[PDB]
Amino acid sequence: PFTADKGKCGLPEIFDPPEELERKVWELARLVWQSSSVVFHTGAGISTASGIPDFRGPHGVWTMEERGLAPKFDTTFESARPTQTHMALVQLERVGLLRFLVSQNVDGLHVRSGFPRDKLAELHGNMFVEECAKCKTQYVRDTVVGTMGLKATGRLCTVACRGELRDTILDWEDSLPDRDLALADEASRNADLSITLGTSLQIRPSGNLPLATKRRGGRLVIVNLQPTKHDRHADLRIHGYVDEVMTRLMKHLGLEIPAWDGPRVLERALPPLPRPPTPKLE
Ligand SMILES: Nc1ncnc2c1ncn2[C@@H]1O[C@H](COP(=O)(O)OP(=O)(O)OC[C@H]2O[C@H](O)[C@H](O)[C@@H]2O)[C@@H](O)[C@H]1O
Ligand SMILES: Cc1cc(F)c(Br)cc1NS(=O)(=O)c1ccc(NS(=O)(=O)c2cc(Cl)cc(Cl)c2)cc1C(=O)O
Numbered sequence: 713p714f715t716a717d718k719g720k721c722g723l724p725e726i727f728d729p730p731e732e733l734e735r736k737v738w739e740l741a742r743l744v745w746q747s748s749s750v751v752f753h754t755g756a757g758i759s760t761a762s763g764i765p766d767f768r769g770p771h772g773v774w775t776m777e778e779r780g781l782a783p784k785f786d787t788t789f790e791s792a793r794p795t796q797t798h799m800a801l802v803q804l805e806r807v808g809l810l811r812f813l814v815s816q817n818v819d820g821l822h823v824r825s826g827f828p829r830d831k832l833a834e835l836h837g838n839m840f841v842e843e844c845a846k847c848k849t850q851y852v853r854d855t856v857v858g859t860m861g862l863k864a865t866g867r868l869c870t871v872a873c874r875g876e877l878r879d880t881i882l883d884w885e886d887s888l889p890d891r892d893l894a895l896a897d898e899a900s901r902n903a904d905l906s907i908t909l910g911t912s913l914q915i916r917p918s919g920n921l922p923l924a925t926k927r928r929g930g931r932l933v934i935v936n937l938q939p940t941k942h943d944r945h946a947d948l949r950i951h952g953y954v955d956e957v958m959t960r961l962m963k964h965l966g967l968e969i970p971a972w973d974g975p976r977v978l979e980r981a982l983p984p985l986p987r988p989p990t991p992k993l994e
């Protein structure tokens with residue numbers, strides 16, 4: 713806890729120049745159009761543009777710790793809006809282009825964006841989610857559950873039970889939720905394209921899942937300002953703001969980024985909407 717290995721913090725940011733940046737986003741478009749089963753892996757870098765600091769970025773929680781400095785929030789967890797990237801992943805799932813969403817993030821913004829919970833693995837847990845120790849029923853609350861490290865929150869289960877509610881925030885020592893991990897692994901193994909957005913990929917087994925897509929000839933794309941643990945295994949590496957990359961990507965795909973009505977929870981994915989027809993590529 714004190715002893716925790718927080719890995720490489722504060723590594724230098726890489727900026728692809730705009731012409732290389734444009735070519736790499738086009739190649740990502742082409743990879744998406746070709747792929748049967750696309751899986752997205754997200755980390756703390758997709759929420760920076762909403763006021764939530766990352767862990768190992770220049771002003772990351774762990775980076776600032778190392779330097780004796782505090783990280784800076786520009787929002788509360790309750791008042792944070794989903795970014796353009798968050799809302800773009802909502803859309804890609806609605807049009808059948810995203811098969812599964814693997815996230816390390818505990819900030820709750822994927823669920824609040826309206827992303828279907830049955831297409832999402834929250835590997836590190838969710839600050840707004842508490843779980844009944846007895847019956848395992850999960851509640852998605854409108855305010856952060858006030859504990860971390862799988863502690864009693866002080867509420868009881870109301871299922872048709874009176875189980876002790878606990879938080880879903882993993883401590884360093886805690887093994888990942890078997891269901892979210894099982895579904896994350898299945899999805900990664902069978903994908904022909906895994907796209908990483910704003911994770912350094914330093915945490916086991918979280919950061920290793922996209923590499924499983926590389927077995928049986930799957931392609932891996934890493935989108936990240938900093939070097940990441942698996943850069944050498946990437947077919948494509950894009951060094952740029954994820955919001956800039958995903959907005960350029962959506963325009964290539966001919967998709968609008970949808971409006972956020974405010975915090976909403978969707979347990980199950982809706983039937984797939986229409987999507988633009990595919991370009992001739994070869
Ligand atoms: N706007 C941006 N666009 C692109 N990349 C960005 C942006 N902002 C930040 N980054 C990059 O985003 C990356 C964020 O990487 P890390 O900070 O390690 O977060 P994790 O999700 O991988 O941390 C995993 C776990 O480790 C912790 O212990 C917690 O448990 C986490 O759950 C950095 O390389 C940034 O350069
Ligand atoms: C909870 C959280 C979610 C995020 F998405 C981001 Br970004 C940051 C945070 N928290 S933080 O500010 O940066 C943040 C990071 C770490 C900890 N410490 S700890 O691991 O839980 C811990 C402390 C002690 Cl004394 C014993 C044990 Cl066994 C564990 C607290 C906070 C916080 O809330 O004060």
Ligand SMILES: [Zn+2]
Pocket residue numbers: 844845846847848849869870871873874875
């Ligand atoms: Zn219960």
